[PDB]
From a paper:
The crystal structures of [name] show a common scaffold with the vertebrate pLGICs, such as nicotinic acetylcholine receptors (nAChRs), except without an IC domain. Opening of the [name] channel is triggered by extracellular protons, but it is unclear which titratable residues are responsible for the [name] activation. They are formed by five homologous or identical subunits assembled around the central channel axis.
The first one is at the C loop region, where residues E177, D178, and R179 potentially form salt bridges with residues K148 and D91 at the complementary site of an adjacent subunit. The mutation shifted the EC50 from pH 5.0 in the wild type [name] to pH 4.8 in the NQN mutant.
Numbering used by the authors:
A (entry chain D), E (entry chain B): 4 to 316
B (entry chain E): 5 to 316
C (entry chain A): 4 to 315
D (entry chain C): 5 to 315
Amino acid sequence: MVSPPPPIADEPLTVNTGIYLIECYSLDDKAETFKVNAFLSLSWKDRRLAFDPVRSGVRVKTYEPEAIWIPEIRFVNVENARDADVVNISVSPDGTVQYLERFSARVLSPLDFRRYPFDSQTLHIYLIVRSVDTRNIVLAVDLEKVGKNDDVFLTGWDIESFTAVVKPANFALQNRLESKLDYQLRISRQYFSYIPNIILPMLFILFISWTAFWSTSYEANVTLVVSTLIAHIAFNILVETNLPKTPYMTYTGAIIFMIYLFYFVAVIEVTVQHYLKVESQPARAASITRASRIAFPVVFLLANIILAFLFFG
Amino acid sequence: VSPPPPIADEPLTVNTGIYLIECYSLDDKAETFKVNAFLSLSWKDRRLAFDPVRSGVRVKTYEPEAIWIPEIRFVNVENARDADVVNISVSPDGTVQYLERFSARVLSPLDFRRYPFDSQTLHIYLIVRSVDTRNIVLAVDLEKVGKNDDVFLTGWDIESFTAVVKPANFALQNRLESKLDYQLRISRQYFSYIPNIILPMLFILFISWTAFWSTSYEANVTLVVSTLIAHIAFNILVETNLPKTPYMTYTGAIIFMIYLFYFVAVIEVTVQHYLKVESQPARAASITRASRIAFPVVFLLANIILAFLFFG
Amino acid sequence: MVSPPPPIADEPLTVNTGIYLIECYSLDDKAETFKVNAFLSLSWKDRRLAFDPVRSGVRVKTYEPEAIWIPEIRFVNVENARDADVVNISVSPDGTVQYLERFSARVLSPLDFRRYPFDSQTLHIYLIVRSVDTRNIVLAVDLEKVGKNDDVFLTGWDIESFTAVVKPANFALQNRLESKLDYQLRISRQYFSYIPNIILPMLFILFISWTAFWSTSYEANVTLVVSTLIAHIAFNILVETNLPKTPYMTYTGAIIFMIYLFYFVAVIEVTVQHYLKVESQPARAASITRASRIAFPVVFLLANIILAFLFF
Amino acid sequence: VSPPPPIADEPLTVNTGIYLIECYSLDDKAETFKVNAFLSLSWKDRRLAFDPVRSGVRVKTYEPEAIWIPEIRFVNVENARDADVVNISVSPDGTVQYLERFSARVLSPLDFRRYPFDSQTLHIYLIVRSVDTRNIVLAVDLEKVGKNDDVFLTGWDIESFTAVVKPANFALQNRLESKLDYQLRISRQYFSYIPNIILPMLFILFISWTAFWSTSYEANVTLVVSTLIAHIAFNILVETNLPKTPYMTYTGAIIFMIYLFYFVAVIEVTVQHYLKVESQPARAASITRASRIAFPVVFLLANIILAFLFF
Amino acid sequence: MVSPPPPIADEPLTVNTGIYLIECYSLDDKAETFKVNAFLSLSWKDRRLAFDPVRSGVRVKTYEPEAIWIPEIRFVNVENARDADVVNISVSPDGTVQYLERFSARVLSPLDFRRYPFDSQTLHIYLIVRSVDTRNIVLAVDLEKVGKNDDVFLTGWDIESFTAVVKPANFALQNRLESKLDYQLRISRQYFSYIPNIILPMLFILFISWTAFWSTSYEANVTLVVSTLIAHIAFNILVETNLPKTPYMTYTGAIIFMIYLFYFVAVIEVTVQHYLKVESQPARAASITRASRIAFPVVFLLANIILAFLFFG
Ligand SMILES: CCCCCCCCCCCCCCO[C@@H]1O[C@H](CO)[C@@H](O[C@H]2O[C@H](CO)[C@@H](O)[C@H](O)[C@H]2O)[C@H](O)[C@H]1O
Ligand SMILES: O=C([O-])C(=O)[O-]
Ligand SMILES: O=C([O-])C(=O)[O-]
Ligand SMILES: O=C([O-])C(=O)[O-]
Ligand SMILES: O=C([O-])C(=O)[O-]
Ligand SMILES: O=C([O-])C(=O)[O-]
Ligand SMILES: O=C([O-])C(=O)[O-]
Ligand SMILES: O=C([O-])C(=O)[O-]
Ligand SMILES: O=C([O-])C(=O)[O-]
Ligand SMILES: O=C([O-])C(=O)[O-]
Ligand SMILES: O=C([O-])C(=O)[O-]
Ligand SMILES: O=C([O-])C(=O)[O-]
Ligand SMILES: O=C([O-])C(=O)[O-]
Ligand SMILES: O=C([O-])C(=O)[O-]
Ligand SMILES: O=C([O-])C(=O)[O-]
């Protein structure tokens, strides 16, 4: 019973799979991984294990994994092989097997940071099986064996759905045939905390720098504008250490970067206004400084609209 | 290796209890803790029954592979528990005493709203899945449930460890599951936050307020801006030690409120120097005179209002 | 066999234990744990294994662990079950067993930080054994099997002693009998590095702030006193991240918090002197500023003395 | 459980290939990466040979304990690989096809000179040690060598995965070792460094240069020293994410060079106020007038020279 | 066999050892540990296994580890027991065993930080075997089995030599006998990076603080001197979090501490110069400040030499 069940015809062996999530947890943005704890259910027909109900008298016979051949099912993206404990194995009279295990794996599914922290992610778990010489194996989904618990909580995220792509992608690698199945976790980030923790404070320190437009004092203007620039770096650093380095540009990264210009420009202005006022044309100096108090906030709200437009529209 | 047959119409009851030996590594960001305990399991398998007077031994000892043992799992654990079986014992009627020593890492979500004044109820869930030949049902044996007196969770006070006796039995995938809820109850020891965070965070606020006794703009800007920065160091320090909640923490509210008092104190500092640059010190020093009262009052006012919303 | 030696007497089985430290390392203050590598020696009498020296011809017989019953000795405070390798097992003719393993476990021993970093700590390793139904087990110490190597070094600490408490504390849990033994490592922290790294620089930034008392310039005084405040926050945080959050107050914790007052008050003085001097009574202004230059250092040394007294 | 004999005097050739499934966790300070791949091994043991027509099965399936398998190790890995044997199959003539799926953590040093413009070659080394009864020799079967199309190394671009075909055979402790070299070729993705490090690092420098259009010492010192501090924050931030090299990184040169400009800009600032305090503003504002030019020019000059030496 | 080979004399069993380094890596200064991957070679003669080459037909007999008795060789300083996989076992007709394993251990060897980062270290790997009652076991070194690969690289360090001290120190612990062997890895730290990353930037901030000696402006001098103090704290902290806490005084620790004094005195001077200048005695004030411009750098170069002298060596 070690080998695989023989086909009484010309046809491939269909394994029926399902995943029911018990724990979902440890989503790690920098590593782009998350940890999962679930039931795996497997079902297939090995007729060699078939038996007579009345002769045997038991409605169903129970086997150990070493007793019967079980197909080799792998996750494609996992750091290592999953840690699994076999819950139960059952054979129905005709040779239909019902396998149930409980596994803990660490899944590696890449993420999209463009709209961070407003982004939504689709996490992927890929099931795979390699066909043998004596026969070909093909995966399939049994939908009542697919679901998630109601206690499932991914900290800092909202779980929309866990569903499977029912048609497996069959393909050829190194002369054997592989059947790949895709289970998808769909989650949206909880953005609330980012607002009081990062976004608002980052605005306040910016607005504060603008009070330098109501001052003709260079010492106090420089001190003001430079000190708030520094604080904006602390936030820049804080944000960037908590994210992976993307080949592309994050929304927050844009905003954070745009704000770098407004500080640079405001230094020029502060510098210009003091250059005129030292050269005795405060006529222009206070005229520019008068325009600043308006243009600066307008071009901000302007830019932010354009940015938010490019990203979310 | 097959489960005990009913001589009746009835399900199998496994009697569980948990006794805490070590409790430790409560991690706020991860929302996990580590635990070391005895697991006690007890059930009747009549197939193992024997005569007390004939056999002469009060109790018989088996190894785990010898006899059928029910599969009991924790629902919320990072992985399967690491356990060493302490003892197995059979008494004449077929009653088994199973005792193991396990260490697991439990994932129990936390409530951060009152931080760091909060209290938490940690949950350990035991579960068992029913078989085809029979249904298994968990139940609590209370003298097998407790905790050691050396049990200490650092930075926490342990109120109680108790079990909810009625298992919640339900249906998952055509089988039956019996789930039990063991509860650890703890309150956060908040003392250290006072000298470490809450107090220093006030001083810098108060220091920021002496700018109301100054008419000097360079020295007021320096004053108010420097205390702002240190308040960021504290804002950052606090939030890195906490997970990101969909909701608003008490300390988080306070820290955020305090951001406003810095913003307005900046407005005043700027206003006062604008009037006084334009030669109307009449209003300028009048405002600056009024702030010295309003700020501490509007502070104490809000703090009272906040503390009400959170703790009342 | 898989059963414990029968007493021919009314007597308990006494197991003779000792620990000899090979490696000691990774003392972690925040977690309150240390890692240890040692020999465990176990010795007890099982008569079933007894034999005649001259008939059998070997002074001593050697067994593999699966052959004979060995008592289950556990550590009470450890993150997980110890990782151990059996070095040797030997039976002497009368039925005396000599068991030796080499283990590495991670022990969880709580610490007292009140005198930090001038404190001394006693770490506890607890050995335990649970009695079975056919017989009771009791621990005892063989003092020649207890020691530590001379290369044993605990980084950043000085090791005073490794000794065992000889009378086991026996007690009852779940109808069985538990025998608990206590091994004590005694260490004193090496405080030297804290002096150039933390304590001294922290005084300097304080003293530096005090030169504002020889200055009448507010613009430069605020900058001075506020800038040194910030550095004191850096040192406050640097210290606090390396310690667990205690329900009580540390020596270093007191000093650092005490110093926060001197910064707050110095701001008041600095502010007062400038409010007076703007109101044209430099008589008062420069009088206070002259008096602070004395009071501040004296009330410091006063406090430090008072603090050091309470703490020691 | 003994190695196949030699029907002539000849070494045993094991045919190896690695096919990347997951590549991930590239760590610059440790100089490691983690890998998930198939290992394919193939060799001929005639003791296992059988007749295609008489025996009737195209192929026979074994468990690992039945037959002798050569011991193949990786030279650079933190520990032994975690491996699961996928399949073992024997063809009539005695040729074995061995397949496992392993996860290892590889230790390959990196070259940081052009950081973050650098490209790296990661090395996986396979090795086998000869026995007393026979010599074993590695060889590459190229259709068993590849990578999945979903394979992604975060923050890097993967150019190629290829193998060096001639094993370097040599003598260690009286036996013979056949070592094979698999090369992962990757280029760093530098884009993020631009808004996150390089640009802000320039702004704070340029801002410090506005002190040349100001005659105020109080506000100039405040300016120039405060912008210096931010450059330390960036100097520290950069160097903590890199291992300590005996040589000089590009970014390291740039960051170090910029330390000079702050020192000189301080000297200029001090001089200008020393002249202006000693009352020859003729020179003071002349120097300060030249600074507004020299500084940006000697910078752009040096930066070109730096990029030249490095590229 | 669970028992050791019998003496044909009154003499001990000599196990012949060697270590050949494959990988050396993860030197951790704070923990004082490093990781190693090497071959272990063991050779000893157990005559119970002797055989006739022609009768048995094998030139050499190959055994599995459970088949034959192997001595228990342990490492003294390792966090846990080594993780070892056995490469080969071979018996020659006379009963001479050749054992070869490949192990990866994490060795704990304490360090000397006094000359940091100019320091050189000797790392120690200690092998040990405990003697039994029926016989005494004794370690010895076979030098052709001892070496290291030419690819062995310890990051941030230069490896001088890998050699073994051949005479084992045999001694008595708990009524049995221990034979201990000492393998010595000799390394010197690569100090280059420390220069542009710490030492130079740390000198610049000090020198910048000295320009306050060419200024009579107190507001601008206090800002200058105090702000550079802060930067030096960052460098002190950065350096110290990267080192273990020594009971003794490090070279870098000395310099960093000494420099705290030059910052303290420069504040005194800066305070004095403005106290005199406030009291209308510029005669002395600018006189001191004229001397500081000399004394400060000289008392520095003077001190640095005395320090560098005391440390080396
Ligand atoms: C008021 C303001 C004054 C002070 C401002 C605050 C300054 C604080 C700046 C320092 C923040 C921390 C930066 C250093 O991060 C480092 O992160 C590295 C990990 O990525 C670690 O690397 C180092 O440690 C290894 C093991 O000990 C060594 O072998 C490496 O050589 C070493 O580089 C170091 O242990 C660790 O120190
Ligand atoms: O083999 C795997 O990848 C798994 O399922 O963990
Ligand atoms: O095989 C089974 O059903 C089991 O593990 O109980
Ligand atoms: O401070 C100044 O010189 C000013 O008012 O521009
Ligand atoms: O056998 C066990 O310990 C179980 O119930 O999982
Ligand atoms: O199987 C589990 O998850 C457990 O209970 O340890
Ligand atoms: O938690 C589990 O079920 C496991 O990993 O075996
Ligand atoms: O000090 C002030 O108020 C100023 O800057 O004009
Ligand atoms: O049997 C023992 O000594 C144990 O508990 O590992
Ligand atoms: O389980 C334990 O405590 C042990 O044996 O270390
Ligand atoms: O010099 C003094 O004593 C003063 O200012 O009062
Ligand atoms: O010998 C083996 O099975 C191997 O390649 O590790
Ligand atoms: O031991 C090894 O090198 C491996 O992981 O294959
Ligand atoms: O102000 C200027 O343009 C100058 O100094 O030449
Ligand atoms: O420059 C100053 O601030 C002074 O001398 O008063």
